Structure 1
Amino acid sequence: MSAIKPDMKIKLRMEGNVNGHHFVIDGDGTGKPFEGKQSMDLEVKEGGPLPFAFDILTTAFNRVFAKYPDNIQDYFKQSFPKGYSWERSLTFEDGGICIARNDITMEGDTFYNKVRFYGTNFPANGPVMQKKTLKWEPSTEKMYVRDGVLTGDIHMALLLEGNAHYRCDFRTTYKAKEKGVKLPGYHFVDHCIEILSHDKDYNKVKLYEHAVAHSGLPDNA
């Protein structure tokens, strides 16, 4: 009943500020919500070349794109056609801290995303300011309800140059715009986000994500 199509278009605008550095980034993409896959082309419109690792932004560029089995309530697909919003904190191991918010609507065959991303206290010689990141590793988000609110936790890690890892704790709260959307029980979403291609300074980036929900062992087998 979402009126979501097997093939959806995606438009996005992000505005934000990290360590005092302002930026605006536009995105235009497409995806398959029932296969849990999406991809997007991003262009930095203000603030480029970004003076920090593009990677920290990428998870902010929609859990509608996650393959849900029939036995787990899919809160995100049921939030539509109206939509939903999420709010996230990204707590990095060296004290960098970011918060982000997305309001997601839908017209026709298109999701519209209004994304804000603010961060500070990244050390000047850390991997983020020094642009030493290579990618996010795959991850598994733990989804559960806390005082009526769908919440997601993830231990994330950025692979660095030299092959060390730089850890980050995500916590996201998700809220349907309409009242009454039924809450799922405790479950998982596996993710893998990748930059497919980019120019030298990441002014232009092609992003891809794949996500699948599941119930853990022994169920996931």
Structure 2
Amino acid sequence: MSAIKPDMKINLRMEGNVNGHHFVIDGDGTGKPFEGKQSMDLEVKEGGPLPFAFDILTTAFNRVFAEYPDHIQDYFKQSFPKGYSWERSLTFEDGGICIARNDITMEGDTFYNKVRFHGVNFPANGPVMQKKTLKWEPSTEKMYVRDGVLTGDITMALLLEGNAHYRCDSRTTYKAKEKGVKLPGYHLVDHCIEILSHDKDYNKVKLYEHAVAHSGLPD
């Protein structure tokens, strides 16, 4: 009924603008939806070398790639073959604010991702514009229904140079394309995201993510 395969391809085009700098980024990769794992090779096609930390873009580069236990409704795998969309705001602690969206379709073995990313008000000598970010720290998304819609709320942190941290408050709304996909109960999604390799300027990046859904303590 769902047509989600153990191994899937990922096609992606991201376009957007941060701090007035336009960019286009293409991604091709593979994932294991039932294992909650995915990888992607990315190439900056326009606007390279990027004047900002590549790390701010990486959560925009699909919750279908999360390991869901049987006892939790898997909204994302239940959304196919028709697919779904998400919208997200990223509010950073120094006033940098980004909005993003992805329209996700599926054709055969391949997920297609139309991603948009817009960012404003990053300070000139902040860690984003100065490329002082090292990685996203592992974090946990809270999944719950708000105004008829599945919503993911998370506070994430970028590890910085010198082992400082840089806070980002994120809210995502997820919407199945097909009418009447059953919404899940409150649950948690643990994730980690990692740049596996990159060239000096981050014109080429190999990206990986692992995500696991769960009910949290006590079980």
The alignment's TM-score, normalised by the length of structure 1, stands at 0.99
In the aligned structure 2, how far is the partner of 1:2 from the partner of 1:46? 36
1:14-55 Cα distance to aligned partner (Å, 9 max, x none): 000000000000000000000000000000000000000000
Deviations 1:118-171 (Å, cap 9, x if unpaired)? 000000000000000000000000000001100000110000001100000000
The residue aligned with 1:103 is 103
Offset, 1:103: 0.2
How far does residue 85 in structure 1 lie from its aligned partner after superposition?
0.2
Match of 1:45 in 2: 45
3-state DSSP class of the match of 1:78? Answer: helix
Alignment correspondent of 1:153 = 153
Where do residues 13-28 of structure 1 align in structure 2 (5 Å cutoff)?
13-28=13-28
Q: Deviations over 1:92-137 (max 9, x none)?
A: 0000000000000000000000000000000000000000000000
Match for residue 124 of structure 1?
124
Structure 2: runs of 5+ lacking an equivalent: none
In the alignment, the residues of structure 1 paired with residue 11 and residue 84 of structure 2 have an alpha-carbon distance, to the nearest angstrom, of: 15
Counterpart position of 1:115: 115
Residue number in structure 2 paired with 1:12: 12
Q: Distance in 2 between matches of 1:120 and 1:147?
A: 27
2: CA distance between counterparts of 1:57 and 1:2? 29
Q: 1-side partners of 2:4 and 2:140: how far apart?
A: 25
Q: In the alignment, what sits opposite 2:29?
A: 29
**1:182, CA displacement in angstroms?**
0.1
Identity of aligned residues (%): 96
Distance in 2 between residues matched to 1:101 and 1:85, nearest whole Å: 7
| TM-score normalised to structure 2 length | 1.00
Aligned to 2:179: 179
* Matched position secondary structure for 2:125: coil
Matched, 1:63 2:63: yes
Q: Deviations over 1:45-104 (max 9, x none)?
A: 000000000000000000000000000000000000000000000000000000000000
Q: Deviations over 1:190-219 (max 9, x none)?
A: 000000000000000000000000001001
Distance across 2 between alignment mates of 1:147 and 1:205 = 37
Q: Could you list the structure 1 runs, at least 4 aligned residues long, displaced by more than 4 angstroms after superposition.
A: none
* Alpha-carbon distance in 2 for matches of 1:190, 1:147: 24
Provide structure 1 residue ranges, at least 5 long, that are not aligned to the other structure: none
CA distance in 2, matches of 1:196, 1:170: 24
Q: Distance in 1 between matches of 2:153 and 2:91?
A: 11
Q: Report the 3-state secondary structure (helix = DSSP H, G, I; strand = E; otherwise coil) of the residue aligned with 2:58.
A: helix
Q: How far apart in 2 are the matches of 1:67 and 1:189? A: 9
- Measure the CA separation in 2 of the matches of 1:210 and 1:2: 21
Q: Secondary structure at the match of 1:153?
A: strand
**Whole-Å separation in 2 of the counterparts to 1:206 and 1:107:** 23
